[PDB]
Design a protein around this ligand. Structure first.
Ligand SMILES: [Ca+2]
Ligand SMILES: [Ca+2]
Ligand SMILES: [Ca+2]
Ligand SMILES: [Cl-]
Ligand SMILES: [Cl-]
Ligand SMILES: [Cl-]
Ligand SMILES: [Cl-]
Ligand SMILES: [Cl-]
Ligand SMILES: [Cl-]
Ligand SMILES: [Cl-]
Ligand SMILES: [Cl-]
Ligand SMILES: [Zn+2]
Length: 316
């Protein structure tokens, strides 16, 4: 909507207060004009029609329970936009400042979130498995990263290419979480998963096998569930990424960590310059070796650690 740029205040799903960029024209809208062509957050109103209504508010204060998921979808989209722009000089998902749209209150008791090819969509959870899924900066960033992958590598959502697609989303979800720096970790979805159980999460990057995901190529899933296991076999790549950043010895193979920034640079470069729609894990390893060679040189520690991390997870 055409209007003037304002600044509202609200509370997110985890009860924290934050400022949101809004747009005023009779009502105050969840339209952030300060980032690219805009960040727009919508109310799906417990239905499944998308995007639903551009979120409107009478007074620019967003402290109602109903408001909280919209607040976090809006705010965390902004944080993720800032990560891509400040850290990787990428302007929105398409690199040309595309508008970023999100819908909250999607369906009733919907325990999930997704990128639908055009926008982010967030369930409220049923209240036991999940609370509103936009509550998780790692979740928001995971979903927006699917948009980045769409416009870049274009990794097909099935089998190895699909597990790469997933891992990139978990990788950058986590690196966004670290960038925002509120109790960040190498787990996925902890802020919104199982409110009655502490310390669990949906997936683990540091130890995928904690939730039954493989941490070695030998353990890859080859059935048909989950599009050939895209959220399962992502464990192999997430563990490689974790190793590259943090270091560690995994089935006897020792990896010297090179830190998060370098992880991010290497996988961003691979994503945007070397991966293709049909890339497999072996192709990821080479892309990641080339990206590191490009950035740090053939004989660098960074290249050596990329290779160690892929050896450790059984990917040659
Ligand atoms: Ca209000
Ligand atoms: Ca996390
Ligand atoms: Ca929990
Ligand atoms: Cl919050
Ligand atoms: Cl997903
Ligand atoms: Cl934050
Ligand atoms: Cl398990
Ligand atoms: Cl399934
Ligand atoms: Cl650390
Ligand atoms: Cl770092
Ligand atoms: Cl190699
Ligand atoms: Zn995903």
């Amino acid at each position: 909507i055409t209007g003037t740029s304002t600044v509202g205040v609200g509370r997110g799903v985890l009860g924290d207060q934050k400022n949101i960029n809004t747009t005023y024209s009779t009502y105050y809208y969840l339209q952030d004009n300060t980032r690219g062509d805009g960040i727009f957050t919508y109310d799906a109103k417990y239905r499944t029609t998308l995007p639903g209504s551009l979120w409107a508010d009478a007074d620019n204060q967003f402290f109602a329970s109903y408001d909280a998921p919209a607040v976090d979808a809006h705010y965390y989209a902004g944080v993720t936009y800032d990560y891509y722009k400040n850290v990787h000089n990428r302007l929105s998902y398409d690199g040309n400042n595309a508008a970023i749209r999100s819908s909250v209150h999607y369906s009733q008791g919907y325990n999930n979130a997704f990128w639908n090819g055009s926008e982010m969509v967030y369930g409220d959870g049923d209240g036991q498995t999940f609370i509103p899924l936009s509550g998780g900066i790692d979740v928001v960033a995971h979903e927006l990263t699917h948009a980045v992958t769409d416009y870049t590598a274009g990794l097909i959502y099935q089998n190895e290419s699909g597990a790469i697609n997933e891992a990139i989303s978990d990788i950058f979800g986590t690196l966004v979480e670290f960038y925002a720096n509120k109790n960040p970790d190498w787990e996925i979805g902890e802020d919104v998963y199982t409110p009655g159980i502490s310390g669990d999460s949906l997936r683990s990057m540091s130890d995928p096998a904690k939730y039954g995901d493989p941490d070695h190529y030998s353990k890859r899933y080859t059935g048909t569930q989950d599009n050939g296991g895209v959220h399962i076999n992502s464990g192999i790549i997430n563990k490689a990424a974790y190793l590259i950043s943090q270091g560690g010895t995994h089935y006897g193979v020792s990896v010297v960590g090179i830190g998060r920034d370098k992880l991010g640079k290497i996988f961003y470069r691979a994503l945007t310059q070397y991966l293709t729609p049909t890339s497999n894990f072996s192709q990821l390893r080479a892309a990641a070796v080339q990206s590191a060679t490009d950035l740090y040189g053939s004989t660098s520690q960074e290249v050596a650690s990329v290779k160690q991390a892929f050896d450790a997870v059984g990917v040659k």
